[PDB]
Amino acid sequence: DTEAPQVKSGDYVVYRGESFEYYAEITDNSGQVNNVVVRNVELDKKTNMPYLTPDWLKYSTDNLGQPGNATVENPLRTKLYGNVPLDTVVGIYTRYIVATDPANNTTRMIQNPNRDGLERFVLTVKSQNEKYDPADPSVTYVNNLSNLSTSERDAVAAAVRAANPSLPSAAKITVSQNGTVTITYPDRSTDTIPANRVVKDLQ
Ligand SMILES: [Ca+2]
Ligand SMILES: [Ca+2]
């Protein structure tokens, strides 16, 4: 056996403050894979060993080291998962999935976008606001569209929550002097709802 295992992955998106779960598929001409490693291409400048960042990106593979566990008909599944911290940066990470067969052939890491979705994958970390699309609330009637009272602002905030049960429980809903709504997600990103869908002049 001189053929390394092959990997089929994809483009993975995750969101701060949210959990994620993706599955990559691994095959080998022998039908058996003994190890799968998800890793940065470069070695940890300290231990001289492979590592994986971000530290919140985890992986696990069931049924390693068993005959017939990685056939083209029934590929081996590696789970990539985690909970994205609220405080991590938003950005892209390009990482590699490398598997080893009984002959100790291991998938090669090739730094080329033409390998994206195979053994190389791009993990996009977006802000939490990008997971949600706030819905307009039932309008609140106000005396003056240019100068909302405290109680009118409170009522708008409640109306926005009532119409958006899917929003993170810890999101903060604030309302400006003209009825503009800001939804501040736990990761501090924001969405806005324009006043003209939220408030109406009483008269
Ligand atoms: Ca092989
Ligand atoms: Ca949004």
Author numbering: 244 to 446
How is this structure described in the published paper?
Siglec-like binding regions (SLBRs) are among the streptococcal adhesive modules that bind sialoglycans. SLBRs contain two adjacent modules: a Siglec domain, which shares some features with mammalian Siglecs, and a Unique domain13 with no close homologs outside of the family.
To understand selectivity of these SLBRs for human glycans, we chose comparators from each branch for detailed study. Although these three SLBRs are >80% identical in amino acid sequence, when they were tested with arrays containing 49 sialoglycans, they exhibited distinct binding profiles. In comparison, SLBRUB10712 and SLBRSK678 were more narrowly selective, although both bound to multiple sialoglycan ligands. Specifically, SLBRUB10712 bound strongly to 3’-sialyl-N-acetyllactosamine (3’sLn; Neu5Acα2-3Galβ1-4GlcNAcβ, Fig. 1b) and a small range of related structures, while SLBRSK678 bound to only two of the glycans on this array, 3’sLn and 6-O-sulfo-sialyl Lewis X (6S-sLeX; Neu5Acα2-3Galβ1-4(Fucα1-3)GlcNAc6Sβ, Fig. 1c). To reveal how similar SLBRs could include or exclude different sialoglycans, we determined crystal structures of these five SLBRs at resolutions between 1.0 Å and 1.7 Å. We then evaluated selectivity conferred by the FG loop where crystallographic analysis would suggest that the β-branching of SLBRHsaD356 excludes C3 fucosylation, while the larger, unbranched Gln of SLBRUB10712 and SLBRSK678 can bind fucosylated ligands. Consistent with our prior studies, parent SLBRHsa preferentially bound proteoglycan 4 (460 kD) from human plasma, while SLBRUB10712 bound GPIbα (150 kD).
